[PDB]
Design an enzyme around this catalytic site. Structure first.
Site, PDB file in Angstrom:
ATOM      1  N   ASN A   1      13.472  17.838  13.726  1.00  0.00           N
ATOM      2  CA  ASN A   1      14.815  17.378  13.359  1.00  0.00           C
ATOM      3  C   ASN A   1      15.090  17.402  11.874  1.00  0.00           C
ATOM      4  O   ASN A   1      16.064  16.796  11.440  1.00  0.00           O
ATOM      5  CB  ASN A   1      15.044  15.928  13.940  1.00  0.00           C
TER       6      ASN A   1
ATOM      7  N   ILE B   1      17.865  15.653   6.927  1.00  0.00           N
ATOM      8  CA  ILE B   1      17.470  14.868   8.099  1.00  0.00           C
ATOM      9  C   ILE B   1      18.585  14.975   9.117  1.00  0.00           C
ATOM     10  O   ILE B   1      19.668  14.470   8.855  1.00  0.00           O
ATOM     11  CB  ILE B   1      17.106  13.349   7.861  1.00  0.00           C
ATOM     12  N   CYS B   2      18.393  15.571  10.266  1.00  0.00           N
ATOM     13  CA  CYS B   2      19.457  15.985  11.190  1.00  0.00           C
ATOM     14  C   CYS B   2      19.988  14.860  12.172  1.00  0.00           C
ATOM     15  O   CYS B   2      20.769  15.170  13.071  1.00  0.00           O
ATOM     16  CB  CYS B   2      19.033  17.191  12.040  1.00  0.00           C
ATOM     17  N   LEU B   3      19.462  13.641  12.086  1.00  0.00           N
ATOM     18  CA  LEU B   3      19.762  12.467  12.878  1.00  0.00           C
ATOM     19  C   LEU B   3      21.277  12.079  12.921  1.00  0.00           C
ATOM     20  O   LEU B   3      21.912  11.941  11.851  1.00  0.00           O
ATOM     21  CB  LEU B   3      18.894  11.342  12.193  1.00  0.00           C
TER      22      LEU B   3
END
Lengths: 76, 148
Positions: B77, B84-86
Site C-alpha cells: 500500500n 501512503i495509499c491508505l
C-alpha cells in the site's frame, strides 16, 4: 477481569469480561455501549489487529490493558 | 491567524501517547509533526524504526491531514517514493478524527497490510505467489533500510 478503551475523540469506556471471551463478543459489548456496528469496528492492541474469532488469551491481553479503535467496512 | 485545533493535536499526544508510537513537534511549525512507528511484534517488519512526517492543511479539521513514509519499507500500500495509499488520509474526514487516530491507523498499516486493495501490485502478486517469501523480502528490506 476488567480492561479499557481510550481512543475516539475525547472519551474513555471500560470492559468487564473473562480471559477466554472472543473479540467478536468484545465488539458486540462496544456496539452494546457506544453504538458502533460490529463490521465497522477494528480494535488494535500495540500496533496489532485483533482477529474476530480469537480471544484475550490468543493476544495475551490481561487485567488493566488498554485497546484502541479504527473504523472501516471490509475485513472482520 | 494560527488555529488552536493544530497545537491541540500535539498537546494531547504529549499528555497521552499511543503504545508503539513516539512523535515530536517542530519549533519552526505547528502544522508539521515528526514521527517514529516502532515496528510491530512478530512481524516481517519487527525491529524497524520507521520514520514518517505529517502535515496539517489549512482546511484541517474539515478535511484530511497528509503524511509521507520517509524510511524505506517494502509493502502492498506504498508508492515507489513513500506515498501512503491508505483511504483515511482522503475519504470521509471529520473533526471527531485526530492526529491520534491517523498515527494509530498507519501503526495498523505496518501490523496488517492489504493485498486485496494494493497499489504496489508487484508486491501483492509476490504475496499471492508465496507469503513466506514476501515475509523474507520485507525482512531483508527492514534490516537493510529501517534499523536506525
Amino acid at each position: 477481569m476488567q480492561i479499557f478503551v481510550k481512543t475516539l475523540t475525547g472519551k474513555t469506556i471500560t470492559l468487564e469480561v473473562e480471559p477466554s471471551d472472543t473479540i467478536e463478543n468484545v465488539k458486540a459489548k462496544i456496539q452494546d455501549k457506544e453504538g458502533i456496528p460490529p463490521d465497522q469496528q477494528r480494535l488494535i492492541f500495540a500496533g496489532k489487529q485483533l482477529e474476530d474469532g480469537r480471544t484475550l488469551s490468543d493476544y495475551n491481553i490481561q487485567k488493566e490493558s488498554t485497546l484502541h479503535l479504527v473504523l472501516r467496512l471490509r475485513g472482520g | 491567524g494560527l488555529p488552536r485545533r493544530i497545537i491541540k493535536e500535539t498537546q494531547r499526544l504529549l499528555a497521552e501517547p499511543v503504545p508503539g508510537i513516539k512523535a515530536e513537534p517542530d519549533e519552526s511549525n505547528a502544522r508539521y509533526f515528526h514521527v517514529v512507528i516502532a515496528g510491530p511484534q512478530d512481524s516481517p517488519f519487527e525491529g524497524g524504526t520507521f520514520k514518517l512526517e505529517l502535515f496539517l492543511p489549512e482546511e484541517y479539521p474539515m478535511a484530511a491531514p497528509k503524511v509521507r513514509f520517509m524510511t524505506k519499507i517494502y509493502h502492498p500500500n506504498v508508492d515507489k517514493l513513500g506515498r501512503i495509499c491508505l483511504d483515511i488520509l482522503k475519504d470521509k474526514w471529520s473533526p471527531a478524527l485526530q492526529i491520534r487516530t491517523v498515527l494509530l491507523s498507519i501503526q495498523a498499516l505496518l501490523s496488517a497490510p492489504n493485498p486485496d486493495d494494493p497499489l504496489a501490485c508487484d508486491v501483492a502478486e509476490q504475496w499471492k505467489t508465496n507469503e513466506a517469501q514476501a515475509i523474507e523480502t520485507a525482512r531483508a528490506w527492514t534490516r537493510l533500510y529501517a534499523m536506525n
